[PDB]
């Protein structure tokens, strides 16, 4: 195959990998992590509550 | 009749030889262009091989 036909396929693979990375970030948001360490307060919302 | 037809076949073969020379020049130019495209990296080796054939 020509090297252009390799380069554009490699570019499409890298684009799909970046899309997988963004979907992995959005999947990492739904298990919400504490951004810092310290003392936690009360949960203002409990389980069953809808958040936006 | 034989001498006339032989002279006519000689002239016709010479004209057809000139046209096949032009065909060979055209194929040489096209093969050189495909060789340039393969050396750059845009065309694969198969497109070079068919022009070689």
Automatic annotation (TrEMBL), chain A:
Subcellular location: Cell inner membrane
Protein's name in the database: MexA family multidrug efflux RND transporter periplasmic adaptor subunit
Domain of life: Bacteria
Gene: mexA
Family statement: Belongs to the membrane fusion protein (MFP) (TC 8.A.1) family.
Full-sequence range covered: 188 to 239 of 442
């Amino acid at each position: 195959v020509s090297k252009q036909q390799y380069a554009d396929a490699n570019a499409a693979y890298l684009q799909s990998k970046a899309a997988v990375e963004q979907a992995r970030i959005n999947l990492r948001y739904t298990k919400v992590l504490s951004p810092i360490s310290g003392r936690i307060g009360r949960s203002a919302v409990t389980e069953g509550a809808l958040v936006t | 009749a034989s001498v006339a037809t032989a002279y006519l076949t000689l002239k016709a073969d010479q004209a057809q030889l000139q046209l096949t020379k032009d065909t060979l020049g055209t194929y040489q130019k096209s093969f050189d262009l495909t060789q340039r495209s393969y050396d750059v990296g845009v065309a694969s080796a198969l497109d070079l091989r068919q022009a070689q054939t």
